[PDB]
Design a protein around this ligand. Sequence first.
Ligand SMILES: Nc1nc2c(ncn2[C@@H]2O[C@H](CO)[C@@H](O)[C@H]2OP(=O)(O)O)c(=O)[nH]1
Ligand SMILES: [Ca+2]
Length: 104
Amino acid sequence: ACDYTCGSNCYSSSDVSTAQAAGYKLHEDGETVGSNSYPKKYNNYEGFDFSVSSPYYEWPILSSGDVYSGGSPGADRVVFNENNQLAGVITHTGASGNNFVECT
Ligand SMILES: Nc1nc2c(ncn2[C@@H]2O[C@H](CO)[C@@H](O)[C@H]2OP(=O)(O)O)c(=O)[nH]1
Ligand SMILES: [Ca+2]
């Protein structure tokens, strides 16, 4: 079964955990990856009611299970905070434009 389902993508908790550990580490070293500079601040334009405190950073989670390292980031993102608490998994899939919806 899926712990998080983002459109057609299936993610297990381990998947989220491995992406999140990668995003935070980079967040801590003050480094970026890819043309869209990840991880980056997540602004909450959407106004989702996260259970963890802001500020928020987004990093891509890939359907292949590989850790993002450049090129296409895909539509899925793992959202974490300063304390490395998971806030949520979100996706551009099924969302208009560059908006996001939460993975279910
Ligand atoms: N929609 C949306 N995008 C954000 C937010 N914070 C940063 N972004 C990024 O800014 C762009 C302009 O909205 C979005 O595509 C997204 O980049 P990503 O596509 O690379 O994740 C946010 O709260 N909402
Ligand atoms: Ca997986």
